Design a protein around this ligand. Sequence first.
Ligand SMILES: [Mg+2]
Lengths: 469, 407
Amino acid sequence: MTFETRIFDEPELEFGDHHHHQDPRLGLSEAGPLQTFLGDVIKIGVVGNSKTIEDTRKFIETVSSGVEGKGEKHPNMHPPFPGLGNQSPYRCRFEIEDGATAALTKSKLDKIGKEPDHYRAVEMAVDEIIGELQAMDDGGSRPDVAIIALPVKLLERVWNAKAPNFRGMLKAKAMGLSFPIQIVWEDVIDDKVTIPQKVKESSSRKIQDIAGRTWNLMTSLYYKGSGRIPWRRMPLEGEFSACYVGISFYREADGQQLFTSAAQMFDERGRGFVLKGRRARTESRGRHPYMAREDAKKIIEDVLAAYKLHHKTLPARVFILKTSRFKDEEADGIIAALDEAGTELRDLVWVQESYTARILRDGNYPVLRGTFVDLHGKGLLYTSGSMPYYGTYPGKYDPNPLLLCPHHTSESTVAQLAEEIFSLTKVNWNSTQMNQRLPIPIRAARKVGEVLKYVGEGEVISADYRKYI
Amino acid sequence: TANQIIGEIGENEVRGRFLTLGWQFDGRSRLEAGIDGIAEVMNEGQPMARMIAVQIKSTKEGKYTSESDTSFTYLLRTQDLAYWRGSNLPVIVVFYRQSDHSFYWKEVSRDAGPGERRLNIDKVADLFNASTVNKLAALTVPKTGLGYYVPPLGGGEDALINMLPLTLPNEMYIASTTYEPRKAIAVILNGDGPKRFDWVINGGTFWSFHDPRTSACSEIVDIDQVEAINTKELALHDDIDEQNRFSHLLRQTLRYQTDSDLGWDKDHKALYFRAIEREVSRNFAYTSSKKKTDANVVSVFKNSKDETRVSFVRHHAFSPRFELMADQWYLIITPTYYYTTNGYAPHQFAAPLLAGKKRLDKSAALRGQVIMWHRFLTQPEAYLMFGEPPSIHLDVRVPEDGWVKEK
DNA sequence: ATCGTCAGCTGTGCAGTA
RNA sequence: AUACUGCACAGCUGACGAU
Ligand SMILES: [Mg+2]
């Protein structure tokens, strides 16, 4: 048997003034963001210790004027950050206001530090932080995005040396405030400090140098503060209207219950790309990663209603990505919930990250990004690999490629859908990295499920994506 | 004259050597005296207007200055460095040796304070070719400035997929019988004959491919209810549970076959094979077609602090999964290591040295590992033979020829 | 209620990406 | 917790087989 293969060109993304480039950093540098900001200032708030507030201000004033990257071996992999001055990528200024200076007390950290019950320490720490943030939101000093950068002293007596998380219930509680939060471990804002790891206590974590962290955190802060999207994937000329839904899975904070997760995105009329979640919690029925009928039907109803509310028309094509097997328990419900609304095209793809076979080529380098092989219906696609642009391989071992398994109800061929998700992988607003592997709806649903894993019942969830990355 | 005619031959023929790819070449007027026709890059015939100035020179025949089989040097003039300055386009110089029709070029990036002039050509890695052209073509892009890059330039490569075409026997035997498998192992363990397992007892049925009566499996199959059936009619089912039963049959079939040296494996990774005295192999003779090479298939490495005791013994392993490919069964091979204390118990700590080995590893050793690991697998009741993994043709070529090796 | 074969799912963690 | 990849380990859901 001879297997047909395919090579896809690296996709280009939209930017300001109808620009098109394949690199988010360079696309922001030449053109600016896709949507500009009417205001010219973004207000930042700091929560933590006095030293951490100081070094957060030092971090902002350090990266305002621009800080270069790393060695000259790969100039395309670590571009310099041109700062926030005259030639800002975001064309806005980022200021810390004087009314948001939340400094914690050493007596409280001595108090919480007591570890009789580890669970109550996490709960009362998170409750006191959220109470102080709520007290800050009440006054006339509302920030836009709050850095809540944790100190070494509090975190080491709650995370490693004591088992619940921190980020999960912390963002589960920071849900009524009219601004998102961003946790910053102390190494990011101050590079002189070294924080030891938990299990290999002799060893410790290693991070990037300066500017990659600067790029990722500044893009995250801009998207959280302004609310205007930095980039989106460029639509093709003469293409139909499409809608992307993704479904992921998780386990709760108990023994034997699984609760599932979802995410959703589409396009706007003028120039935009929405990306949201759902305001309703998902309950449990069993422990297999399955969907039943009413869950899939109400997911499709929600996403179609949210498209119709924005475009005043139903979409012409629905694209759904899952992680477990696409069986007939829920595919009948999906297809019925599509045909009651008259949407013609329909694609349903199971994504497998659990395979047992790879592809081997000559030389010391593996296959490039986007290499496609067709296994008689299976769509084996390498969403990572070597880079003609980054100039090298950013990894150690052979990458585990995605296995496309389209459902037999799907419309398009296995080669078009892989190119579509190959375009869809680089719409990660967390970072500016190019070597994304999982597609963005599965990634977004995983983030939503990780946040919703610890949400208490009766709490209203937010569909705004700024509280998730 | 003669050398003038040789030069006018050489410029046209290096024009042709540029023309064998999408590397469109243009000529020059009469009165220039220091640069010749200019080369322009196109990918697949589509221009993007990237330029290289080229200067031609040519000889007829003979050994060059200090010429060897792998390298040869040359001398350069003194007044030409002003025009050989690393200008807006690099000035690549080329020479012709007509005898083996060779077109020599060496990189001209930028002259500097040394001013060594001359040339340091090698025979193998600085010749005009369709294999190392990206390293040729990555010169006009400067180090300063970001966003400029050149795509892969032509060529092709034949890759492969780690798969084994197995040759299954045509027929196998179905037998309905008593002696449920716990009683079957309880009666078959105390034996000295051919107590070899290649069956699944499912619903009180045997489903073997070797003769059950003519072995130590006589008591399980009894003296009757033994027949034969071709494998093709019952290979295709509508019930996926029956397909899983056939996969169970395949695994227990190989469990006989791959019980060659030290099989009978407990984890999902099979092939625990090893040695008996020094616990080394140094084996899997891969004869190839130009030379044979050996690799440490079973490896013994002493610890750093203590040298008189063997720290860990290394073996190779794989995990089969038995995926049919449109009514055709292939074996999926997934290579992995097996650190062991001595042969029977898992090692205490060996993970960070495997990760360290993977850290300095490439994917070149993987493919070579798979081909040497199949060169042994191609060689009574068991056929113990296997075919060849398939190969595919790539549209594009990896630009590693224009890059530097990792570490 | 465990046990090989089966194929897969999530949870909770450690290097550095040239 | 600025991102992402690879290794290592442990658990639970549906069609399979027993003393
Ligand atoms: Mg973030």
